[PDB]
Amino acid sequence: SFSGYLKLTDNVYIKNADIVEEAKKVKPTVVVNAANVYLKHGGGVAGALNKATNNAMQVESDDYIATNGPLKVGGSCVLSGHNLAKHCLHVVGPNVNKGEDIQLLKSAYENFNQHEVLLAPLLSAGIFGADPIHSLRVCVDTVRTNVYLAVFDKNLYDKLVSSFL
Known part of the structure; x- marks a missing residue:
């Protein structure tokens, strides 16, 4: 199972880890x-x-x-997880760098509710340009299923945990 995750809420857990290595x-x-x-x-x-x-x-x-054509920003599709997982849930968070509507981040996280447990990154964080602190807040306020968040960056992980309300 998942190990070394810090519990943030009843259903959200977090770890400073490379999601590829975790998977x-x-x-x-x-x-x-x-x-x-x-x-x-x-x-x-x-x-x-x-x-x-x-x-x-x-x-x-x-x-x-x-x-099928492209997904919508805020949407998702389930494909194979290949050597990483049973399934990969491809979720499209808004890319702030591409000028996409940040309000679609909650819609993006709603996709997680269709799965009982997920290993996930913070949506719209990293190269997608949104504030990861905001992404974590939307995650905990939207996702009701069990989500294990892998945060690649150590310094960002420390900032996320230490600033968590």
Whole structure:
């Protein structure tokens, strides 16, 4: 199971960890990917998860997009977790750097409620440009299922825990 997570609320847990390494160790039922609408897994969590799958995630994703078209900002799709998890829940948080509406972050986190337990990153954080403190607050106020948050950056992890209300 998940180990070394700090409990923030009844259902939200957090750890300073690389989500790729966490996924390979735990092999969760669901790993969340910080996806974009095109499922183009170039950088950040998406690039890292995809690289760990030897690009199998990107090949599967391109077939999904060819069939279904792009996701909506705030939306998600369930695909294979490959060698990382049973499933990957690709969730599109708003990219503040691309001028996307930050109010869609709550809609993005609502996707997590369809799964009893998830290994996840903070949506819209990192290269998506939103304030990770705000993302954690939206997470705890939106997600009701059990979410294990992996925060790659040690200094950000310390700031998130120490500033948590």
